[PDB]
Subunit: 488 residues, 4 copies
């Protein structure tokens, strides 16, 4: 049994709350450790540590700040196997999934190496007679980020890389479900040459989150998670006068046109639907074949691929898919699957009976596939976040388009087609922030930016890319002239 | 007596609430007209009108959208006299001030002529193997803007020019104190070739604003006004999931170093302290001379010039200054002046007695100058928004800098000095968004961006400049590839 | 008979060389006027004028400079018919063509209205300890532009709009074939409020070009014309230490894939092949159908449309196409046509017979269409610049792509297809600067940039867009710090 | 001469010998002795390097930007690991101190750091609905194969200036470095291979004018970048353009420091010592002219400078306390000595005379003592000519306008500096001067890797600077696509 505390001022520390939460191993269903839940006083200590450290860090030139990230990237590559094992053991996903998690975080770190260029502001000479005008992008001061269970490496680095690169200090409040990676990341930042107090990790639940939102020394909050919590963090942050960016849930659709490469479409669906047991806000949860023949041919190819998925713990490196994160998630998913049957959807692949020998207590659910799903059913309206894929049969292109158009969620969407007209038209019109053309998971790369539309995000600036530099800096504008003096 | 309604769908329309507010001529103190206070039906009609028109507007190419602003700029020039007259008549400020108000709005309209270039997004070829990745900046849809009494031309234009250039529809809720100019602007947009429904004006008070904040079809809200109301709007907009940018109050300081051009500092203090009867969020309301000799010489120069300010109605074109906007504002200012005297400050120029013959009921206050002001006084802590300049004597550079630094407000600040070290150091350290070096009112031009720090703004994007374009657009990122086909 | 001189220092002035050049009315073959050919002395006078005015102009703020362009755009709209008339009368093209010529130049003027944003440079705070680093984009001084016969409005404006917006003085040496428009444009710039001497027009031939290339006070040269002369001007300018951008000839191919809309492609070929009598470096001169059926079906649709082209003077407002610019041009084209026949190509529409009643001395040639053209033929290798379209039957996709790939010219190219894969692959791989997907004449808009590859351009910066702002400015970088002074 | 080493070329991931059997001698300038030789490329040697580049470039251009950037991240780490070795070989051929050599390498390293951001930097522009259903977008694609010609004084920094953005952008690159000190460039190319760059993407071709002409007339090389003297820059620029190539060339300097009466004179004098005599003045950003304003400023400045010039520690790279080493060649030494003589015979006052200086045990080294001239006027050779040696000239200016007009009127416009406390004087001076790089209380205003380097007037040719975003522009060509679709299977 291991006990995680917090990471403050360069050290792992125990905290003072007398509160803990259990860390499970979701493959066995057993408790493997605890994590401390920060009190308001523990949060205050992290803020005071960030306050004491931030000015010297902001006073370090951009090139030197960038060198910390360069060093950190090498450390990540050096510590990859260790990081992935601790991630998988708490989260449930495969070693390869876990490495992908780390790698996508690493890529934001690579991006912020370019902070000297990225943080440039604008200069105008002769805005008026002898008058120059120029901006400067200065740190906001102290930022905080709140992250979900599914990417405990990538999403923290999404936020802390640009925030710290811009010369802010940063308080990370990660998911209490799987907190080993975030602490290890902050430890590695120290090893990379980051001053103590610039990246603090404060573990906790709602209590720690409320403490962050109400602290008058925190300037900016970044959130990734479910839509209901995203709304609450966004509204509350604003109510406290802070800047905020929040990113929510999804029900990503893949539309399949009759001219599409059906083999590639089926392959994309198995990976996008069932990768990480469907625990992704960019999982494809709805497949929309256009026309009966397309549906039938696609289902024909897809069904066997779902049935032959290898399910197992992270120690089995041959497995395609692991358990879901908690018993609660398991039960919530199972209840949703039952509602699908009850409401008239056809469960073509039924995974409810799956048990893994030796792991009967793990949070394991077999792959599920529903056909004849309709927009009024719960399995369609609700983000399931499990290995459950729904097929809605569309009669034509306009009908197919209107499905993701009309959904509450607008995170990601995909269209599979050979037709340039269909792809252009669909990607132009859809009210969804991230679009795949023959690409099933259209997550933009670290140097572009990430953000959904509709109920999938709140605020006006995305994750990473240039948007992140904007979010973590305040603009100062100077207008400048001089009286005539000694030159005359 | 005139009776202003709303401007919805290309025309002037009567309100349907049955409630009006009184429009005063501040120079005589009598009612000259009324303005309707929008009901929910009024806002709903404005939203429906916007919804009907926005798609075809967004589908118009950027160069064609730009040509509308082209035309509009010419129409503003042609109608300059008429616009200035109606502005001054309701506001109080001089015709010259009213032209300035309009022209600074006009310059945002010129800036957005560049919308084809401004709206460009980013393309990457070969992000992956055969994969291209690119963003598009699309309209948010329908936006709203809430504006204050003091600039009913400029500030409406600040918001609606980029909002509309970006392909959005825009609902203006201007100050009910002086709503003539806003309706006339919407009318001139129609004459410029703007489609009906794209710029709508809904007049009203807290009622209209709350309707705007809670209407599910408005995506974005921009606010300029007092800090308390900015706090409210920012929080409420966010609680409803909207993007928001809010800009608040001020207590702008000018620091005068002993090496400064004192003649120019003193002239700048007359202009910035007493222009518009001090009714500006970029008015200088604190003069911070460094050293006794600097303070005493500055007082020597200011006294005769504050005393000789010519005060009068807008029909008097020699007047340096007009009346304040309402009886309420006047009483608030006079009350704060009294507290200055009560709390020990030295009223070296007393304008309390000033009366204008023929205009005995107008809201006229003579220029006031306080010396020996300290930071514990009400006249120092509170934004007065009137013709009251306070002098706080600092002993050295560090004492002087700490004054605007510790202030609750952080809109603008100025430093007067011949010394490059003092200027650079001051501009770099001060926690204030807009800094002037030998410039009294460092309002950036339309092509740079406007926004204060601390309690002077909320959100993460400024007014106009490229910030505004970011605020009025949402980012869509497409990831794109193709299966082998007919080319093979 | 009319006599054109030069436009120097705000005035139409006479040439002092005594040498003149004939201006033809291509529709009748008669001489309608003469244009002065600049001496070395005439050029020197224009440079002395430019040198005298540029400092004051560069000292004018970017908003004021932009306003000149705003007024100019209105003056162009006001004078459209007169401009188009003088253009068509000297060039030969239709009024509608001439209006397009002027409009596209007008669009560059609209783009440079945004010069205050476009000319921004970069700022870094704390590049070192207490050290700031920032660039300024300042004028190059005096530029020159050399332009060809076919777009005597658009091309001059391409060059002088950004040159002048950037704070430079500009010397235009337009084509002596049709010099009425360029002078009128200079005159209108004056009316728009441009100071005298900022835009001078120096008419002439090689003599004037050589005088520009060897004048020590001209910093930069822009050229558009034939490849042989672009090569000469690029080399000579550089041997004289000038910066240079030169843009050359073309042999634009259109690839028609078997899945293309053949109606649309044939219609596009008529406009792009025969518009302006094919006197465009973005004209399609080679059609490349893929497959036997595609070629046969295409030839079939084209023939009746080529046969029924309406050919007349600009005074016949029903005409689709006018005469070519000179008898020299006409003899060259006819000579090329004959070479096509003798080299084995099938002439399926023979325009050689064409004569127009009452216009027997006009430079009229009927539309020509060849089939079975192969890469070894002169009509394939040589830019014809006449109404002669060549069809090259491709067997497959790779064969079709290799045709424009291997051509010495690489100005524009187009692919007609419904297939995303084919479109993307062709566009990505082709060694040609301007690529159309279902667009026959992919000339970028003013806010993007123009320029070919291979033999079609020389230098490292394109015409208009942000490229042009880069070409007409030089970068200065300031590194700045201050010693400890009075602030301490 | 002892045991000499022999450098050839670096082509396709390997050191290879020259096929011309012509060599150039490599000296140790501390001793004056030959220590090795370098091969001078034939046309065939260059042709081999171009063919090498041609075969390899397409696959490298097809590698995604993030993967290209990682080669540079690894390379940066390799530079740090090999810093001491790299500095040693540089100093031994060039003359400058080990610390100088490390700064040379570090500034090259900083360009490699900047091009790690190539994925963001290479982005192009997109417009939706430029017309009805019509989209318009650009792509920045490789030019193909570039070449760079570099001078003796920074054989690490300058090659990296050029090859880092060229290679990050997806091109292959042929470096032709100075034959004076060719060890570093080849070792850099070796380290690029060790960092994972494919063979043939960075080739090094050693040689003289012959190799340069072979570069300038090779039809497969699309772009040339040159840094060196103004006469050769003119030649490279013109000839490149004659051959249809794009080119950017960077030339000589005569950098002035203007000292206002209100300046921190002690900081100015200290700055002049470093900027005037660092690397024995062999820098195109060395201050070679001081311009004090007014009598007292001049007299006091001179008085400060004299004993600091006199007490400079001069020695070989093996003496780690030296401020300055020998100049690069015998030729360079003779030319510096001729120019010093010219100053005396044309009337300048040689207040510190370094002509006599000899170092015990290094009598044949190219060592010259620090020199300082007062009462220099604009008609003298020491003023008009770039000396490239440890010779500082003091021109007395009576006022601000006169002080400003000296760098204004000079043929060269590489760098300039103004020392003052006055915001007005600095702003005005920096705004008006016709010189590309300006220091305000900064003696050597060389911009950082993420900004850009370029002089004005005679100091540069072309329209794009070195490094910064300019370099990304220079190493890419713009393609624009205009795109629409006909009614399809969606209808
Ligand atoms: N350009 C400038 O000078 C400038 C810029 C920013 C802010 N300001 C600020 O404007 C203020 C004075 O103008 P004002 O009196 O019009 O400001 P205000 O805050 O009273 O009103 C601004 C807007 O909010 C609305 N509003 C007022 N009370 C409300 C309530 N209780 N609930 C909801 N909405 C409400 C008003 O109708 C008006 O449209 C000063 O504090 C000043 O700093 C001025
Ligand atoms: N950062 C810097 O310090 C810097 C920057 C730019 C320029 N410089 C300049 O470098 C110059 C000194 O260096 P250098 O002596 O190596 O310069 P150089 O001009 O003699 O040589 C530069 C390059 O050109 C080649 N070359 C020389 N002569 C040639 C000819 N006749 N034809 C073709 N190619 C030829 C050389 O082989 C070498 O690679 C100074 O003028 C200085 O201003 C220095
Ligand atoms: Mg297949
Ligand atoms: Mg398997």
């Amino acid at each position: 049994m291991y006990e995680l505390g917090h990471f403050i001022d360069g050290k792992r520390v125990a905290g003072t709350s007398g509160r803990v939460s259990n860390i499970f191993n979701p493959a066995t269903g057993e408790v493997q450790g605890t994590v401390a839940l920060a009190s308001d006083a523990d949060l205050a200590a992290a803020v005071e540590s960030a306050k004491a450290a931030q000015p010297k860090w902001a006073a370090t030139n951009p090139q030197r700040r960038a060198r910390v990230f360069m060093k950190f990237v090498q450390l990540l590559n050096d510590n990859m196997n260790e990081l992935a094992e601790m991630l998988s053991r708490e989260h449930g996903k495969t070693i390869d999934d876990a490495k992908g998690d780390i790698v996508r975080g690493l890529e934001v770190c690579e991006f912020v190496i370019g902070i000297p260029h990225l943080q440039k502001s604008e200069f105008t000479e002769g805005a008026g007679p002898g008058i120059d005008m120029y901006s400067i992008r200065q740190p906001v001061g102290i930022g905080a980020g709140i992250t979900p269970f599914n990417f405990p490496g990538m999403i923290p680095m999404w936020m802390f890389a640009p925030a710290i690169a811009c010369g802010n200090a940063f308080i990370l409040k990660p998911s209490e479900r799987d907190p080993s990676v975030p602490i290890r990341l902050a430890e590695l930042m120290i090893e990379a040459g980051l001053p103590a107090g610039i990246l603090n990790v404060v573990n906790g639940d709602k209590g720690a989150v409320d403490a962050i939102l109400t602290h008058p020394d925190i300037a900016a909050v970044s959130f990734v998670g479910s839509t209901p919590i995203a709304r609450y963090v966004y509204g509350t942050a604003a109510m406290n006068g802070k800047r905020a960016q929040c990113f929510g849930g999804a029900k990503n659709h893949m539309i399949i046109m009759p001219d599409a490469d059906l083999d590639q479409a089926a392959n994309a669906l198995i990976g996008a639907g069932y990768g990480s047991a469907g625990e992704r806000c960019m999982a494809i949860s709805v497949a929309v074949p256009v026309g009966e023949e397309t549906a039938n041919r696609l289902i024909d190819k897809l069904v066997p691929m779902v049935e032959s998925l290898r399910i197992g713990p992270y120690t089995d490196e041959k497995a395609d898919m692991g358990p879901v994160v908690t018993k609660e998630a398991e039960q919530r998913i199972r209840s949703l699957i039952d509602s699908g049957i009850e409401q008239g959807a056809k469960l073509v692949v039924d995974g409810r009976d799956f048990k893994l020998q030796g792991y009967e207590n793990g949070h394991f659910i077999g792959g599920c596939l529903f056909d004849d799903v309709t927009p009024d059913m719960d399995i369609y309206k609700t983000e399931i976040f499990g290995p459950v894929l729904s097929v809605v049969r569309a009669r034509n292109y306009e009908e197919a388009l209107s499905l993701p158009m009309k959904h509450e969620y607008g995170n990601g969407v995909a269209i599979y087609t050979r037709d340039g007209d269909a792809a252009r038209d669909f990607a132009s019109r859809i009210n969804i922030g991230m679009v795949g053309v023959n690409v099933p998971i259209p997550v933009p790369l670290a140097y572009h930016s990430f953000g959904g539309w509709k109920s999938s995000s709140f605020g006006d600036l995305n994750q990473h890319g240039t948007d992140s530099i904007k979010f973590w800096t305040r603009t100062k504008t100077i207008t400048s002239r001089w009286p005539s003096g000694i030159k005359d």
